[PDB]
Each structure stands twice: as structure tokens, then as C-alpha cells.
Amino acid sequence: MAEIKTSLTFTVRRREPELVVPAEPTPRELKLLSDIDDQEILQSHLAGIQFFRHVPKMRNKKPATVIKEALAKFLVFYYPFAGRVREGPSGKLMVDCSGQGALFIEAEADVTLSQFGDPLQPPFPCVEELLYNVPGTSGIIDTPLLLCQVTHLLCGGFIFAFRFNHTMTDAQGLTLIMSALGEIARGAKAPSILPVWQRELLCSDMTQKSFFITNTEISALRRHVPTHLQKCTTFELLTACIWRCHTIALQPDPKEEMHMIWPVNVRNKFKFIPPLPVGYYGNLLAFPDAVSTARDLCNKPLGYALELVMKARYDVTKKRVGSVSDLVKPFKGPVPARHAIVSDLTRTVDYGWGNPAFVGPAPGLTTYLIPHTNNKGESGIVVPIRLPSGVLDRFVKEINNMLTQAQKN
């Protein structure tokens, strides 16, 4: 199984980050975060990256400057994104909407869009520099809720990176919000969709390796499972494989309980009554939780883990009509420690330079299924696994063994 090493590196020069406040005074309120965006597993950050080719007619305009000023005007409507989150009484998190400002970095990079390769595909080099981690930012509470970096290129293109605080929205929200920002950058005076905020309706020694698996091997793994389970998604399959291997490789007590947790967006999977509000941009995620004992995962074939993953998916999606509060629920209980997390990154913003050349995303195991078409014309999936060297080599060994077999028969 191949490793993918990023072989591009460049200087980045950044100015000092600036607080962007809404261009117009906004309401000073104390808003509540819903019970979905409040849950522990979602108390992280959520990151994205956009690549824009140079446009000659846009020569008189500085993308950082258009975007920064757009941002001011955008924060007028999305004024929670200029607030800080913090601890309510009891154990609930709220947004202090006082226009403190989002963070914005203007940067330049000694490199050109072309030097990234054909095509633009992740994982990207030097991303830690494209979107800097200003010290005193990475906490959930009392930090800016949005951090964005515009970095312009020697070729006249530019990269736009952004990190949202994940208690405020999810990837789908991000899409809406990014489009809103784009229309305001593009001359509009209001987003096409006017945002609402009604989160009450939802209350009541480590080493890294990235691996490419060709659709060849995926095909093999598919043909090596029970036919009644052969119709799964390739995400489902690969997550089965990772749960299985990570557990074997983790060398834990055969009695330990093993959890395989992933986000599933239910914005468009359920038909809600009452419907959702038109400008809702709160978190809308179910967390299927596939469990098994260590020893069953290790002793049984991949079909056991796979079947369990699909029963998990179904169980969390079983009901398809009802209220949000009945249909969408937090992850039950304290997220375990033996858990493993997998996000699916397999499934049109314009600021004046057109649509992006690429647009995507920057103690237990947390990994991503990243689409990646290879050097020679294989679609496939890149998995950025990171573990301790002991665990990590054992993880590769076991996943390699499964690979050899699945095709070799």
C-alpha cells in the first residue's frame, strides 16, 4: 500500500493578523448554541481551503482587500461570527455577540499555483502556513469564531483558507456561508439567503503517514465480503477496514469495547415537521456509533466489522419524518476513549476571480477519506493516518495483509 509524501515547500510571509468587526453596528446580545452544536465531539474547529487562479482583468484589485472588506459587510448579517463563545451557567455554551471581530491574515507565498501540481488535489503542502495558528486561538471558548487567511501568489493567483469554530456551523453551513460572503464580495448588498439563528429549535512520539488506495484494491476488498453486504458505500467499506485494523494494531485487551464514530449530515436526509428555518446554519449532524468487543473485531473477518458499520448507519438514519429534536440528537454520553473517527470527504463560491481551481478542506484515531486521482489515472482514496510508531507500523502491517489477500484471491 502506497505512501503519499508531500513534495513541495515554500516560504510564506504574513502580516500581523487583524480583527475584522462588522462594518455597521450590530445587536449586542447573548445567543444560545443548540444542543447539537454544543456536544463534546463537535467542540473542535472546522477548516477549509480554496485555490484561485490568477485573472488579468482583476489586476487593479488586491484579493485580500476585496475579501477583508467583504468580510466586514458580511459580518453585519452573520454578526455571531464576530462574537466569542463562552460558558453559560450550568454547562451550556453561548455566543457573546459584541462585535469583537473575526481574525484575518494577509499573506504572500514564494510559489505559484502551477508548482502545486496537476491537478490540485489534497493533502496540500505547507497548509499549516497557509492558515496560521496564531497563538492563543485554538481554544473553543474566548477565541475568534472565524479565522481566514488570504495568501497571494507570485503568479497572481491566491489561496483563501478559513477555520470556523465548529460549535457554530458544519461543512454544509460553511457552504451556504461561503457563498454569502462571495455574493457580498461580488457587489451584492445582502446574501441571497438571509441568515437566521434559532438554535432553540434544537434545544431541550507520533508519526504521520498518508496512504493511497487505488480503486483496484477497493475492488478487491469489495469482492472479498459477503454478497449481502457487497452493496455498501466505499466509505463504509474503508471505515470497516480502518476500525478492524486500528483495533488489531492497537493491541488492546480483548474485552475492551471498541467504538467507530462518524459524522452524517441529515440536513437533506430527513423531512422535518416543522420544517427547518430558511437561514438556519446550525450544526445538523447525526453521529452513528458502531460498537464491538475488541476480540470479535480481531477474531472475525472484515464482514463482521462492515456489517456492524452498516447497521450503525441505518440505526441512526432509521426515522425519516419528525421534528428536529426528535430526529436529530447529540452523541449519547461521554465520547469514549477507545473510539475512532472517520470523516467522508468525497461528496461554486466566487469573489470576483471566478470559481476556485480546487475547493476543499484543510488520542484516539481521527482520519479522513480524501478523494485522490493518482499519478497514472487511478481514482482512489487518500487516508492520512497518524498514530504512535508501534501502533502505526502494526496498522500498516495488518491493512497490508488484508490488501494482499483481497486481490490475490
Contacts of 176 (CB under 8 A, 6+ apart): 193, 281
Among residues 140, 175, 202, the one where a domain terminates is 202
Q: HEC string of the chain?
A: CEECCCCCCCCEEECCCEEECCCCCCCCEEEECCCCCCCHHHCCEEEEEEEECCCCHHHHCCHHHHHHHHHHHHHHHCHHHHCEEEECCCCCEEEEECCCCEEEEEEEECCCHHHHCCCCCCCCCCHHHHCCCCCCCCCCCCCECEEEEEEEECCCCEEEEEEEECCCCCHHHHHHHHHHHHHHHCCCCCCCCCCCCCHHHHCCCEEEEEEEEEHHHHHHHHHCCCHHHCCCCHHHHHHHHHHHHHHHHHCCCCCCEEEEECCEECCCCCEECCCCCCCCCCCCEECCEEEEEHHHHHHCCHHHHHHHHHHHHHHHHCCCEECHHHHCCCCCCCCCCCCEEEEECCCCCCCCCCCCCEEECCCCEEEEEEECCCCCCCCEEEEEEEEEHHHHHHHHHHHHHHHHHHHHC
Phi, psi for residue 122 in degrees, rounded to 5? -85, 175
My answer on whether 225 and 177 are in the same domain is: no
My answer on whether 184 and 225 are in the same domain is: no
Residue 357 belongs to a domain: no
My answer on whether 218 and 168 are in the same domain is: no
- Separation CA 282–CA 81 (nearest Å): 12
Query: CB burial class (10 A; 0-12, 13-18, 19+) of residue 252?
Result: middle
- Separation CA 49–CA 289 (nearest Å): 29
Among residues 202, 225, 248, the one where a domain terminates is 202
Q: Are 4 and 210 in contact (CB under 8 A)?
A: yes
My answer on whether 297 and 341 are in the same domain is: yes
Phi, psi for residue 372 in degrees, rounded to 5? -165, 115
My answer on whether 36 and 63 are in the same domain is: yes
Give the determination technique. Answer: X-ray
Residue 305 belongs to a domain: yes
Is 315 considered catalytic here?
no
My answer on whether 303 and 336 are in the same domain is: yes
- Separation CA 332–CA 350 (nearest Å): 39
Phi, psi for residue 106 in degrees, rounded to 5? -95, 125
Contacts of 397 (CB under 8 A, 6+ apart): 249
Q: How many CB atoms lie within 10 A of CB 351?
A: 24
Catalytic residue among 166, 246, 259, 339: 166
Q: What is the CATH number of the domain that holds 28?
A: 3.30.559.10
The answer, yes or no, to whether the previous bond of 274 is cis (omega within 30 of 0) is yes
Residue 3 belongs to a domain: no
Residue 12 belongs to a domain: no
My answer on whether 280 and 370 are in the same domain is: yes
Residue 189 belongs to a domain: yes
- Separation CA 201–CA 193 (nearest Å): 19
Q: 75: domain range? A: 17-202
My answer on whether 214 and 338 are in the same domain is: yes
Residue 358 belongs to a domain: no
Total domains in the fold of the chain: 2
Contacts of 30 (CB under 8 A, 6+ apart): 94, 95, 96, 97
Q: Which three cell numbers stand for residue 317?
A: 438514519
- Separation CA 297–CA 294 (nearest Å): 5
- For residue 277, the Cα-to-chain-centroid distance in whole angstroms is 24
My answer on whether 150 and 42 are in the same domain is: yes
Q: Taking Cα atoms as reference points, which of 71, 63, 67 lies closest to residue 153? A: 63
Q: Are 210 and 1 in contact (CB under 8 A)?
A: no
My answer on whether 260 and 195 are in the same domain is: no
Q: Are 338 and 259 in contact (CB under 8 A)?
A: yes
Is 350 considered catalytic here?
yes
**Resolution in angstrom units:** 2.8
Residue 9 belongs to a domain: no
- The three-point CA angle 12-17-23 to 5° equals 130
- The three-point CA angle 367-370-371 to 5° equals 160
Catalytic residue among 96, 296, 350, 393: 350
My answer on whether 113 and 150 are in the same domain is: yes
Based on its alpha-carbon atoms, the radius of gyration of the chain, rounded to whole angstroms, reads: 22
